[PDB]
Design a protein around this ligand. Structure first.
Ligand SMILES: CCCCCCCCCCCCC/C=C/[C@H](O)[C@H](N)CO
Ligand SMILES: CCCCCCCCCCCCC/C=C/[C@H](O)[C@H](N)CO
Lengths: 97, 297, 48, 245, 245, 297, 49
């Protein structure tokens, strides 16, 4: 497993370390959206900075199942639940949970 | 286990292909048996129904009085390997000196065998093909002369960055297969495997590769099958400065270990575009030739 | 996509904003084919 | 013992007494994909009797100056029934077909029809008449829907291929002298085990009148042609939200 | 070995680490109807993995002055997914359920919830306050949809029956001290083997806060409750056109 | 047969009810074993989790020091047949002489046991019931007097034409079961089987019986289960002219061979309508009684 | 936090189908990745310079 740059928003060199983790916080409780990214390991995006995105840059075709392991780095007394949905192609960005 | 009776006595999940036909060995043609005169009732071998869809099963013996012929004509010529293993011209790459086509000593050619009409009409007899290849690159001046010039062929797979110019850093071929030939030798010859993500190529693909609202701007992606876009072929004159000999490269492909599926009608009209079965709207030419009347020749 | 199922609940004294780190891998049925040249890199001219 | 037939599958039944025979496409029955051919890792769903049933599409009008029609499959079944609601939610799709075309007339009418199954029937246009512009067919002509589309130049099948060699594929003939229906069972013909059901149309049905219609003044002047088809061994894989196109 | 659990069915998965146990409704697992109990003569369709999956319904807001909510099943699943598109086309319907209610809080919050399954929960109104008019509940209160409905008098459950005896049916408690989720597996409870899925609601889910919420100023003030449910061993019988109600 | 592996090793079509419980015979109460003092670690029988949903499994021996008691208290009183086989008043039919209620010597009564609050509260403890019946019709004057009058009871099944009057031609009972009694005899007693199209009765049916746009006119059909509408009970004074004795009929039903499914809470509020669980909106009365404080009695 | 990766099979997360996988892994070996000749140096020999 290698770190997947989901939050590839910042540009400048003084904040390039912020492109490894994405923030969560307290919402209004409406089933909001946190983050979204494509699942192509041969595209310019979050998968480009893994060991799978550089070793499948040297190959044309790939097969098999991917897996994305998350990790929570918050407090111990703070809980929460997240829905991590995967959409097969054809379906666009959803507007609601 | 199972306790319901409409599943244990069901046929859901039949995976094997229940075939009605069974391929028999036939090394030569079929012989002819001796037949005599027959004047019976009920048994008619000359009357059929074309509305059924099947063809005629009338033997020659059931229509005339035949003779016994031990036929020994071999059918080893009409097979798929003896029909497609003949190298035809599939592409031509130009490298001029002073011009506007390729004035920088390099030219990029996308891989498609549907550029020339003589090879295209044979491979579009079928819908799905599955073959290896033997490419052959014959390089010469436009006047046919052979000059002492070194050339580099490069096979760029789909995804790799194309060379912007002759001195670009993509020509260093660390993983791309490249062929270095001069012109004073026999022409180069490689062997390309079956390089498709699908199980077979397809020259006719009815549909779109993308999703979304297909309007007038995105209409040109119809019929572009991405199981056939095999990359880009690139050539250059191996050096830094400007060359002084004009070049013409010709590509010859022959197929081997050919398997073909689902035959279809062959085209009779003129071709107009690559990977696009357009035709002339006003000039619709009939297949045969015309005569004066039907009662005479 | 990552959607908030319920919320992020936090008591008094603990901070407001937490962070999630995503780590991607491959399975035991992963297979690659047709070795090529890498695409998502470039190189400037005139090394040294 | 051969003129009459009955097709029972699902909760539908077609009975005809002037049938010729039930042709089988390429000698292969429709079936489910085996474990060798399968690519996906999720279990495919398979509604048994709720999608394997006949769907009567539309009624055409075989007039005197008709040319032909074509229907792209399986584009015609994306708005009808549970099959039209499963192919909108699912991604992968695999099914055979069973096509049955009715066309009736009396014993005083004459004419013939050619019912053909052309796999990957790619529509090509006339390139502006002279053959200069790189035109392309619109979306309302490529995938016409359940209403079909009238052929403009039926001799070249609007694709560059001549009509006289069309019978190398699956063909039955509706000749109004002997029979009145043409039944074809088509297996699943594609290079992939599964396929998307919203962009790729597998094969195209072609109904073209070869011999024209003729009758005298006094018979009824309209002769309708109806298409009736049933998927067989349908399978779906991969859930998402409902997208139309 | 008992605090953590995982529910894998279909292509969905619920993982929770503060679970209590998975209760089983009346000691009976959901199953398919046998040949003795069956009444119909047509073969019932059964999509395997395309309907037996979790559907996250809606997010509620457990405030300080909350009273309760109720969802009528299976009214909540007539517009979602392939299950919501099969129950609109089919007539007969048979399924168990598997209900899982998440409600999280910190170790500084206190409160409890009662998650109950009441079969044939018949809504009764107040009869005009004094009990003279023969009033009846409207359609937007009887079958509320996927958004539920807030209880007006939760002590009598808006049906005349008291709340203190509700635990004779299926109940699990979401106490924000020890656990955070309540999982109930409900079998098919009806006098008939099959049933219509557009008028008859089998059972009603009741989520009422027994012990109130409390926290001090500084914690986050909104606590959401989410319902997540999955049908199990779904069956359908009898095709027709799509009717909404 | 079957050749795929995801069906031959699947569990689709499990018909048997996989039960976790198994009913054991229990003719009397459970005894008590001798228990001594126990001061161990880890093994705690008094601490549970009510969040699980199951009840307490704490034996009496694991909490105090018990004595051996051979308990012989029979549990044959709390069964379903020993709880419901007691005839209660389910309906009353009036037949006056000069009035507006039933001035024509006949009255039609729809069959429902939810008209009187004392029988209704017992049968609404459960949701589904399945019972036979023993009806009993005790007829008397409003002053309790017994007069020499002949009466005809008629059970009208759902569908048959109701009598419009006393001299109507539906009273000829060619297939309807009728009971002819006087009043100077013991009261009539019949035995009604389980007459429902469903497999059990139901007193609570959540939903509508019809389809279509349910608006403000068609709201009264909510909760009307048509598996319980068993018909109409009809009485008349058997004769042509006007009678001269007023009558009151009382109906007493007791259930036998009772099976009940799916218990539910019992009602605590006042009833207001038949087959309609309405209650008083302002007068919500608590179940128990109130005191001054919780620290004292 | 342990440091090891995920050992989650595909069967323990969704409802799978039996697939006899026959994709060869003979392309990703070390000999099939490095045995492709690339340019490692260039030597110049001019006349007047
Ligand atoms: C130095 C490497 C030589 C270049 C080798 C190229 C290999 C590509 C395989 C050739 C097989 C034919 C590809 C067929 C595709 C057709 O053009 C499309 N279906 C129609 O455009
Ligand atoms: C001479 C014949 C005597 C009449 C016999 C009547 C037989 C009807 C069977 C009685 C069983 C009770 C019916 C129960 C239905 C309840 O009223 C409804 N569920 C609620 O209105």
């Amino acid at each position: 497993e290698t770190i997947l740059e989901v939050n590839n928003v910042p540009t400048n060199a003084t904040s390039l370390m912020e492109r490894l983790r994405f923030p969560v916080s307290a919402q209004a409780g409406k089933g909001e959206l946190c983050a979204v990214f494509r699942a192509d390991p041969g595209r310019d995006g979050p998968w480009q900075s893994t060991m799978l995105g550089q070793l499948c840059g040297y190959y044309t075709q790939w097969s098999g199942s991917l897996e994305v392991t998350f990790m929570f780095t918050g407090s111990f007394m703070a809980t929460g639940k997240m829905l991590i949905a995967y959409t097969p192609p054809g379906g666009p960005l959803p507007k609601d949970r | 286990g199972d306790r319901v009776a409409d599943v244990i006595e069901s046929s859901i999940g039949d995976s094997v292909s229940r075939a009605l036909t069974q391929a028999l060995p036939a090394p030569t043609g079929q012989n002819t048996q001796v037949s005599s005169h027959r004047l019976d009732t009920g048994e008619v071998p000359a009357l059929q129904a074309a509305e059924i869809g099947a063809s005629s099963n009338t033997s020659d013996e059931s229509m005339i009085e035949t003779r016994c012929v031990l036929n020994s004509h071999s059918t080893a010529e009409t097979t798929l390997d003896s029909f497609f293993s003949r190298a035809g011209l599939v592409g031509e790459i130009d490298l001029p000196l002073e011009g506007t086509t390729n004035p920088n000593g390099y030219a990029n050619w996308d891989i498609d065998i549907t550029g020339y009409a003589q090879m295209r009409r044979k491979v579009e007899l079928f819908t799905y093909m599955r073959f290896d290849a033997e490419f052959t690159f014959v390089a010469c001046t436009p006047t046919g002369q052979v000059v002492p010039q070194l050339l580099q062929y490069m096979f760029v797979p789909p995804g790799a960055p194309k060379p912007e110019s002759r001195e670009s850093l993509a020509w260093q071929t660390a993983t791309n297969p490249s062929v270095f030939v001069k012109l004073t030798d026999p022409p180069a010859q490689v062997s390309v495997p079956f390089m498709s993500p699908a199980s077979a190529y397809q020259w006719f693909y009815d549909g779109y590769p993308t999703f979304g609202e297909h309007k007038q701007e995105k209409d040109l992606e119809y019929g572009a099958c991405p199981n056939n876009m095999m990359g880009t072929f690139s050539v250059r004159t191996v050096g830094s400065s400007k060359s002084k000999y004009p070049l013409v490269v010709r590509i010859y492909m022959r197929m081997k270990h050919v398997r073909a599926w689902i035959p279809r009608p062959m085209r009779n009209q003129n071709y107009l575009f690559k990977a696009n079965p357009n035709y002339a709207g006003n000039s619709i030419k009939p297949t045969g030739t015309s005569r004066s009347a039907i009662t005479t020749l | 996509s990552i959607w908030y199922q319920t919320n992020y609940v936090v008591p008094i004294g603990a901070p407001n904003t937490a962070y999630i780190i995503a780590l991607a891998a491959a399975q035991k049925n992963f297979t690659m084919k047709l070795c090529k040249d890498t695409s998502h890199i470039l190189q400037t001219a005139s090394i040294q | 013992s051969d003129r009459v037939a009955q097709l029972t599958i699902g909760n539908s039944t077609i009975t005809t007494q002037e049938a010729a025979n039930i042709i089988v496409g390429y000698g292969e029955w429709p079936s489910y994909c085996s474990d060798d051919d399968a690519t996906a890792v999720d279990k495919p769903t398979r509604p048994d009797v709720s999608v394997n049933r006949f769907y009567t599409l539309d009624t055409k009008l075989w007039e005197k100056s008709s040319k032909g029609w074509y229907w792209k499959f399986p584009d015609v079944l994306t708005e009808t029934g549970v099959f039209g609601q499963n192919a909108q939610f699912h991604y992968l799709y695999r099914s055979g077909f069973c096509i049955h075309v009715q066309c009736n007339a009396s014993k005083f009418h004459q004419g013939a029809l050619l019912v053909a199954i052309l796999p990957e029937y790619v529509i090509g246009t006339v390139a502006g008449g002279t053959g200069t512009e790189d035109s392309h067919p619109p979306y309302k002509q490529t995938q016409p829907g359940a209403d079909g589309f009238e052929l403009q130049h039926p001799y070249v099948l609007d694709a560059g291929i001549p009509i006289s060699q069309l019978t190398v594929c699956h063909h039955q003939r509706i000749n109004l002298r002997t029979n009145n229906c043409a039944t074809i069972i088509v297996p699943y013909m594609n290079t992939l085990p599964f396929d998307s059901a919203l962009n790729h149309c597998n094969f195209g049905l072609l109904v073209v009148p070869i011999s024209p219609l003729d009758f005298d003044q006094g018979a009824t002047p309209v002769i309708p042609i109806t298409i009736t088809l049933a998927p067989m061994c349908s399978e779906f894989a991969g859930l998402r939200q409902a997208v139309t196109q």
